[PDB]
């Protein structure tokens, strides 16, 4: 080899050092969102118990039996609220992945004739505690978790049934 070859390998080393990285932030966001998924799943038992014993979805954390929304917090989750039987988990606004900062995911259940189907995904809103249908929460701000940061099993749409 010669000096040109050494310069070429130095340039190749520089290329490798300055190589672009994949969307590892998306995978880290999924890992952190798993914590909110678990926190929301924790309240499923209470929500289902209230719905079965009263015939209507729990309006909020009070008669759902779960703790206060601000008190259900984890390392990356700042709140877990209940709205008409829909459990919405909102992540923290700091010390978390930038892609899921102060973003919300949802867990809602539809009562079937033989079972109760639980759906996890983007935020949804149930208008009435007795309603059997859900719809997207609202536009507002960027409070919706992108499907890139949700597991493929946690991307259920509002219209899904």
């Amino acid at each position, epitope marked *: 080899f010669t000096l040109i070859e050494l310069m070429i390998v130095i340039a190749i080393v520089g290329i490798l050092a300055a190589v672009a990285l994949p969307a590892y932030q998306d995978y880290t966001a999924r890992a952190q969102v798993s914590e909110a998924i678990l926190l929301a799943e924790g309240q499923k038992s209470a929500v289902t118990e209230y719905y079965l014993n009263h015939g209507e979805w729990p309006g909020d954390n*009070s008669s759902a039996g779960v703790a*206060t929304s601000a008190d259900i917090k984890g390392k990356y989750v700042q709140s877990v609220t209940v*709205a008409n039987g829909v459990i919405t988990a909102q992540m923290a606004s700091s010390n978390v992945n930038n892609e899921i900062k102060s973003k919300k995911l949802s867990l809602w259940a539809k009562r079937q004739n033989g079972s109760v189907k639980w759906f996890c995904g983007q935020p949804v809103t149930r208008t009435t505690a007795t309603a059997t249908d859900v719809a997207a929460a609202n536009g507002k701000t960027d409070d919706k978790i992108n499907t890139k940061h949700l597991p493929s099993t946690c991307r259920d749409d509002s219209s899904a049934s």
Partner: nanobody
Amino acid sequence: AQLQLVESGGGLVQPGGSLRLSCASSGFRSDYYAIVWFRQAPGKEREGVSCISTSGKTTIYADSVKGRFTISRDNAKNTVYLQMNSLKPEDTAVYYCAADFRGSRLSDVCSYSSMDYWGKGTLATVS
């Protein structure tokens, strides 16, 4: 998690007049309680008048007071205002403001049920 409710604004008023009752809540999570205005008249049991939810976008009023009473909430001042218009002689009572722990600031449901804390009450009479 004790909550203190103070009612103010009650007093004498003429029939067909306007009144405003302010219920101020001081506590750890006063903005987490649905605020329910009940009334009690001499010779009858306590009955609910108007409930406002934690989110403030869901308000329910009694049938006898629907269309005349308006309930609003201010979390910055931590006070709930009940405005009565076209007061009737049947409204002579004592009004209590009570807080129901909803466990969620964004709660859209509130009703006359087991209230965690109660207010002293203000005598609102019209003659």
